[PDB]
């Protein structure tokens, strides 16, 4: 490949951090979260579980060190997700372990910015009843850091929900996809925790 | 750069997989999809095509092998998208080939998680008529794997649509951006296919 | 690690580009944008500022060169965001500098596709008043390239907003999260600029 | 076994690279991709998922060092895939984690060329509807590096799709199998990402 | 040509690195970035896109090995950009793929320093409105590694913006060109990402 | 992207100036300054500090050189502010370091004209007392080059203050926003220094 | 064809050099450059871009080896440009990627001399204003190696500009076409770079 | 002429071999031989000599080196036979030195292939007696390398004898022209020598 | 398919030649050229460019080897144009790169004869003025090998121009379509070059 690029990955991977938040100063890490709802694959009336094929856009900035002076070189490199720390975002009410559709690869930038987009199929609790009716049905699932409080991780969203990718001839039509950010509390801890509640309204076409 | 990081990329890239889904056991790959609608650049009344500047958040987990024992080292590395497998998510009704705004870089994590966020301008079919009226106009585009059925790839969404990034003084105001996941069928195949339908309601401000 | 992977990162990073848009021919770069609203952490009545914990899914394609003939090898690599060029997407009305929750890692693919997902906490202007009422309150923030016009960068969104990740017991319930793409103009320049307006309607549960 | 062969594997494995792309100079890694569609095992109308039994031919060249002077000796050796870096190629819309039919073994050549062919069963989103009709049904799935952009990994194909291996008495007849290479962009990143879209048209015989 | 020079290129190109960051030790790669704004070619009111003809100065240091003892010989050689790794710097909000005005050639120095300057035309989102007014209009575009976080790639700037080259009789007068460096975060990743925001204030003369 | 645009940026950035005022002949650089007062976020009675969310329109002309003959090509390009020289305009009485809301991107034009518009939150000294009264309260802050005298930098304003963007439901109503240009002297130096005094009269609505 | 000719091409192509400057001794490579201005196709007043249909005469000598003793045989052969190294000559200010009118074929001679003449349409920056006036308008574009300094590549011209081929009934009359050679410097490098500035004065007939 | 062609001849002639067989590896040189019998000019009964006007097609491949990278250029050049090595093919039983009708020019090809066709008048021993009879008369002459054994030079023939060119109103009619290849031995040497025996049967018309 | 046919393609493609002119003996390659003018799609008065939809009939004979004895089998096979060498015929004055309407497939025959017919849209320089007049307008474009001289490639035509296919209700009526063969010279080279000048006289009906 390119030798210049080669040095970059090795320096960051070999020299530049183990799993530890590199930021010493006054910063929580914000992670932008967006959902591209690909398809609502299936509904289970007996189980009251619904399946979503989604990919999640995750963006964050990590502190990286510039060592060897940056010359005009390879700006973004791609690396396996395993190589770097990723956020704990989880669906609060998944019925089953989510499965991963896509390769675990993340693009990293010199500024430290990282973009990771997994594709996933998730089963979440939701009653399908009245899917056939014109009114349709509503489901909600909340995503957010399991462990991190708002102080440690701040979640942000650019927009409501990305319908564009949605499969044209999906079994179910999308009434409205929303991603509203909310902060709430748990009995364990005094700290506020932030999650993104994805509320999807859909019916069978 | 850092030698420790250096070894990481090379081991994953040189030793650890060619384009092949690394997961042998009972897992489909789920890809989370989210849309950050940046701007609705233009509307064409004669053509009935509309232009969106979007970035797509894609997340997936790939199986990677740990070889050399992981010491505290570079957790995420960045690499070009070309280096690793990426999902086939496509807009079902694009008028033209989408163009890429941003560098193709993806951040990868040790767990195998990958985050890839492309920025794109897409032209899709949509009638602009009555954009001026208070009611505004509605458009929908579905994104989803072209080839993969729900069994192979499951799509998931965290939330509806990310408005926050939306340009303040865009030509068109955003009534509501939604990303609803749906599964549907095609005559070619008995399998369900999942797509995320992005339904955007907008009018000129 | 894997030697095969090793060569990949170095070739792309060391040999294959400095910060410069590699695409000579007729292409703007499109960046798909999606928001996964994790949580609405806090509201400040006196300040009229609201905090969102979000992650942003960003996807783009960069032109990379294949040098050493691609054998079946490591498809995605992960690299720090600093290594590669990332888009300038910014919140138009942030009160404060956004902080980064997650590591800056991006997965890159051989096709050149990059996925970067940062996690972020952002403070934006928004009046909280009447959060308690049933009607709730509405806020909007626009994200989009600061410098780039629609010609340089096109933004696209798959869906409205990803609620699924939203934290279950967040302080505030999500009425609806939307990401509508819009294009608008500024007095500085004749060119259209595209942004994604994230409109979030929420109330306290 | 043969002592001469013995030295070869150990030298390459023990001495000659960890996961790191070994190529410093001006080369992206190209990976040739071909599909041998073995069978379309099943179609699921409710799920809209289809199952393919495929093996994927992956070829790439890695840089290896000649140390001990090459005498006429064992030209190709076989080794477990785990030993060396493999590409991240993933199906964009797999419903589930792909499972692996065959042993993970790859033949390597002195020139550095590697041939790895996994056998896989993949579930992908696709509507089966109208499978019985004469017209049949069409499905598409895209394979490509998740993380790597076109700059890092370039994908190439020799031909359209390999029908010859196709099971004679499969439940479904093959109208046409195609593998067209395409490059596209994502909102995350400005870089182009390349994927191979496998479009399969089939009907029940 | 000169035989002495001849050996130099071949040794570096043939022997001395594939795409891999060559730096093992504690160094991120810093890439200096500067903009020479040549001209603001056009403004599009309907599209809200603006066109800039720019060349980008990119400088970085790669680790090269001295083999054959350096005698007084050819100090810099020139080579095609394809030969060596280049950074992923991309415009965050380009509407279209940037096109390349100049040959892709980069001068390399013995110390390892590389200077690459592409000339480019870029279309970026920006509202032209009020270009005629005395106040003029402001546009901003951010450039930075797509994939690389601040840890992998550090971006630096010598000065604000180079007006000197600016075309004398350009359609639009330059009020002020600024390049301020900033670091920000994305929802995907905890790491900080650094970008250079080019803010250009211009009006029609 | 577009190759034509590509050459432009590289030529200006790589070849066409480091931080140095390119103008040899009889010209001071004039920088037009305008304020768009977005919002008066907060008032602190104990501290006597007030917060303004503003964006500053800055325009200047830099001398650029035309090299490769300008063909009809990309007229404006966008670049990070870091790439080019920007003026030192500072608020004389900021209590704290101003924070930057927007990406640092500036549009540059062929004529050399540059438009840069940062968005900022600034804390300045000002007594809030009697904000509730009908009379309201007055505050003033002066912006101007710290180092540059009137001879080096001349500041100009098109109009008084831009209220239009002002947030409709801001905590404080705007009685009158004024930007009067004035020149004054300091004990350090015999030269006149020019600043723009922003006098804002506001009260709580 | 002729067997004698057959051996010639194969020997030079198969045996006699890869991309590397074959000249070891004290020689820079001189490339003669001449322009045959075919037509000025169009002028764009809004864009300030002008289109030229040109063919470029390029001549250089490469070192080739005589192997099989040269008998009276085929003196020049023709081959695709891809087969052999060609110079990087580029227009400094092209707005867009130049397009190629003619086949890429170059005649090579036994002495090593090569003649390559591409036909091209180029868009370059140039103000058309006052094209109608008797005075007409002047435009200039500079061509020259992007990477190569005067030491590596020396450019030479036989004459001013070739009008003879100029289309008789072109939209624009040619006042004077000039090709003056000049050497100039760039901030990147201490070395002199040589370019041919084509200054064309034309008006509408 | 063409400069490109010019370099070719000089490189091959000046740099690329003196009379020496350039092929080091396991190859004899094969020379294809064909005869185009133009005319049987005269018969001498007392002398028993017959005159043939023939041209001989000779083809061989020489190893040439490619130096300066082959661009699309002049594919075959022509050169005097003196310039390159030619085979020793001689008529075994010529009564007199053969005379040369045509210019000694040979076409050479890039692959190294050379085609040389001399035109010659040869006097060979042959009894004319019974030329008038219906049976006619037969003559044979053998051509082949004088010095070279079959190991050094291998002779090949495509076909029997080329009558087409034969002069229509020649004094003698051609019954049959044959060129059979044969290998035979001589007392001097143990090696086999190969010759082409031209057996011509002709009578007076 | 047919096994007999199968062997044929593989033998010719796999065994029987790489890009090299297979003919060693005294033959230039003649390529017959014919034009079937399908339609004159458009005329551009400002640009002085005209668009032709044409298909080009190209015929040539290549030397192929018969290996396995030809039995009565598949006489012509079809193959992609990429598989075999095609001539460099180019339009001398195309304004833009020609685009290809039809699949690149060529029929090959056992004798070695190949027939390739591309469909193309070409933009060429031509003044449209007086298209409306009865006299109409004349345009000419020359097609011919770019690199090859008359010695290497000889062009032949069967007839003047094929009107029969011409679209009945085309915007422009065809006065006369002619294809005259001519040979001419260029300053680069002493050799004659042959081209077919297509002179089309047309007017609006």
């Amino acid at each position: 490949s390119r030798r210049s690029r080669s040095e970059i990955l090795q320096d960051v991977l070999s020299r530049c951090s183990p799993l530890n938040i590199p930021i010493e100063d006054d910063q929580p890490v914000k992670v932008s979260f967006e959902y591209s709802l690909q398809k609502i694959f299936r509904a289970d009336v007996e189980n009251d579980e619904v399946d979503i094929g989604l990919w999640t856009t995750l963006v964050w900035k990590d502190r990286c060190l510039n060592w060897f002076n940056e010359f005009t070189s390879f700006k973004e490199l791609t690396v396996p997700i395993a190589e770097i720390w990723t956020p704990d975002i989880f669906i609060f009410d998944s019925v089953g372990a989510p499965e991963i559709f896509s390769d675990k690869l993340a693009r990293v930038s010199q500024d430290g910015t990282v973009t990771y987009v997994p594709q996933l199929k998730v089963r979440l609790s939701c009653p399908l009843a009245d899917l056939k009716l014109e009114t349709g049905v509503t489901c909600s699932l909340k995503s957010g850091s399991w462990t991190h409080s708002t102080q440690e991780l701040t979640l942000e969203v650019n927009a409501k929900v990305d319908l564009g990718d949605y499969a044209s001839d999906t079994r179910f039509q999308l009434l409205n996809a929303t991603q509203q950010v909310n902060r709430k509390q748990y009995p364990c801890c005094p700290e506020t925790y932030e999650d993104t509640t994805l509320s999807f309204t859909f019916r069978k076409p």
Side-chain angles (χ1 to χ4, degrees), chain A:
Chain A
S1 296
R2 287 187 183 279
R3 56 90 180 195
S4 56
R5 179 180 66 78
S6 297
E7 183 168 308
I8 302 166
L9 291 63
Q10 65 180 50
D11 286 316
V12 298
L13 301 183
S14 75
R15 186 183 296 159
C16 196
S17 180
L19 297 294
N20 187 77
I21 297 170
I23 51 180
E24 300 173 16
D25 204 317
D26 189 8
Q27 271 280 139
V29 290
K30 290 75 167 193
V31 176
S32 299
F33 197 99
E34 292 184 4
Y35 290 91
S36 295
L37 178 59
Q38 292 181 157
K39 303 163 187 179
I40 297 173
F41 180 82
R42 196 169 185 275
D44 194 323
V45 60
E46 67 166 341
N47 293 100
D48 285 355
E49 295 175 19
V50 86
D51 295 1
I52 299 167
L54 286 168
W55 76 88
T56 182
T57 302
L58 301 183
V59 64
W60 60 94
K61 293 180 114 88
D62 291 328
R63 179 75 167 173
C64 189
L65 285 59
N66 180 209
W67 284 100
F68 313 95
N69 71 292
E70 58 278 0
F71 279 117
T72 180
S73 70
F74 180 75
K75 297 173 188 297
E76 294 196 358
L77 176 56
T78 184
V79 64
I81 189 171
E83 300 315 277
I84 61 168
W85 175 92
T86 305
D88 62 331
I89 287 63
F90 276 92
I91 299 168
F92 291 130
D93 283 320
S94 65
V95 176
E99 61 173 43
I100 300 168
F101 285 109
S102 63
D103 294 327
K104 183 181 185 179
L105 297 180
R107 179 73 62 188
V108 287
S109 299
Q110 163 269 350
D111 60 339
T113 302
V114 180
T115 186
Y116 173 60
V117 292
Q119 183 169 163
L120 305 68
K121 182 165 183 179
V122 297
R123 297 191 91 91
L124 62 73
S125 294
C126 179
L128 82 180
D130 288 322
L131 175 66
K132 279 180 169 185
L133 292 183
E134 294 283 54
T135 300
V137 64
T138 55
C139 303
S140 65
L141 67 180
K142 298 166 179 61
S143 80
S145 174
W146 186 260
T147 189
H148 279 157
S149 63
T150 190
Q151 291 175 355
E152 295 92 299
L153 180 64
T154 301
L155 295 299
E156 292 281 359
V157 65
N158 289 348
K160 296 68 179 181
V161 173
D162 190 321
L163 310 198
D165 62 312
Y166 196 78
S168 65
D169 291 351
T170 302
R171 289 293 179 87
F172 310 101
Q173 180 189 181
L174 176 167
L175 291 291
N176 53 297
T178 302
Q179 291 167 238
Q180 186 171 11
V181 60
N182 51 85
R183 301 173 303 148
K184 49 172 164 182
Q185 184 178 63
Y186 300 106
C188 73
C189 313
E191 301 79 47
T192 300
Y193 293 86
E194 291 186 29
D195 65 90
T196 64
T197 58
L198 193 296
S199 180
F200 190 78
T201 299
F202 61 95
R203 61 199 180 93
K204 171 71 174 294

